[PDB]
Amino acid sequence: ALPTPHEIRNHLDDYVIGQEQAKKVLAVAVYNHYKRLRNGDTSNGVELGKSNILLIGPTGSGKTLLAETLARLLDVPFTMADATTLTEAGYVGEDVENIIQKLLQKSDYDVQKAQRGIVYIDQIDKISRKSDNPSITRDVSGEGVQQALLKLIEGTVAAVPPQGGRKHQEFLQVDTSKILFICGGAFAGLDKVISHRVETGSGIGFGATVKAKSDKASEGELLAQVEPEDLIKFGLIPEFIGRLPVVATLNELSEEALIQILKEPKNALTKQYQALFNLEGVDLEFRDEALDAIAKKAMARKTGARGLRSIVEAALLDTMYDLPSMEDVEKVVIDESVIDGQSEPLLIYG
């Protein structure tokens, strides 16, 4: 039979931690995509609507991770394109149509199986207009990209070179009214725009309020209050946002979340390094006293989960540089002190 939101969410939890609201949106969309296509031409409520998804969150939150993990369990075709390389009006870079062409490579040129596929885009913020007002001069990597996607998302015919071609004499028609699009990107600087709109203080006098330094505009609580009008001041056009009604607000990694990300997931960094030394005939250990200490260092970097290797590799630099030369080494232990740099990791010999 078909899957369910509880079953699909249980799978994503194995690879993703600390994202409750984000998993709910993707589960309903995927669970609803099978319903729309299955009911196509068989339900009296013809011309079923569509609802794309627009993910938003800080860096290292798991946006690109969800698209990869989703393809593992997803049956229908899936792709991972990028907005940065697209170019409007057939310029030097690739065109919008190239997105559909990549889908056929994974679908084996199955048009009937390609129309029911899913599409994902990363780094959507790169095409945002730098200024709120429309640019006076033409743009090749901004607003124009949004314009070309309008007819694509809603639904339009497309040209795809079947084999051994770039441009014009064989074109395969593929509708796009039923194709799903999952756009995502960490919009930088959006916190400043929402503060002007939400705080509204903008004053120095007695009556005006002066928020106490460092106890305001928490990124997690600020993105939750986002609205489409906020994105207009960022640079996006309202016509583009109208094509993506659904919006998902993620949260920044909690200190407790980082401890779980290194233990509960299967692809955690702790398990990765453990396998790196497993082939070397050497074990590894990571006590809880060291994990909680690493969380404070990571959050200070404000880079996300991806800024964790700098704390680990900087500590195990000396150890890894000398471990291969050493012999009769069966186990390595890294206590909390090693992380601070005031001690050296203990070694166990056979």
Partner 1 sequence: XXXXRXXX
Ligand X SMILES: Nc1ncnc2c1ncn2[C@@H]1O[C@H](COP(=O)(O)OP(=O)(O)OP(O)(O)=S)[C@@H](O)[C@H]1O
- Which chain residues interact with ligand X by CB under 6 A? 16-19, 57, 59-65, 150, 186, 239, 261, 265, 305-306
Give the Cα separation of 307 and 160 in Å (integer). 40
* Interface with partner 1: number of residues (CB under 8 A): 8
Binding positions for a second copy, 199-228, rule CB under 8 A: 227-228
Q: Per-residue contact track with a second copy, 108 to 147, x per CB under 8 A? A: --------------xx--x---xxxxxxxxxxxxx-x--x
25 φ/ψ angles, rounded to the nearest 5 degrees? -65, -45
CA distances from 22 to 9, 141, 191, 221, 325 (A): 10, 28, 20, 15, 46
User: To the nearest 5 percent, what fractions of the chain are helix, strand and coil?
Assistant: 45, 10, 45
Q: Judged by CB under 8 A, which of 37, 71, 74, 80 binds a second copy?
A: 80
* Interface with a second copy: number of residues (CB under 8 A): 118
Q: Which does 281 bind (CB under 5 to 8 A by kind): ligand X, partner 1, a second copy, none?
A: none
The total number of residues written for the chain in this structure: 350
Q: Which stretch binds partner 1 (CB under 8 A): 60-68, 85-93, 244-252, 302-310?
A: 85-93
Nearer to a second copy among residue 206 and residue 251 (C-beta) = 251
Alpha-carbon Rg of the chain, whole angstroms?
24
Nearer to ligand X among residue 57 and residue 77 (C-beta) = 57
Give the Cα separation of 240 and 124 in Å (integer). 12
Give the Cα separation of 350 and 347 in Å (integer). 10
Q: Which does 33 bind (CB under 5 to 8 A by kind): ligand X, a second copy, partner 1, none?
A: none
Q: Judged by CB under 8 A, which of 10, 200, 209, 278 binds a second copy?
A: 278
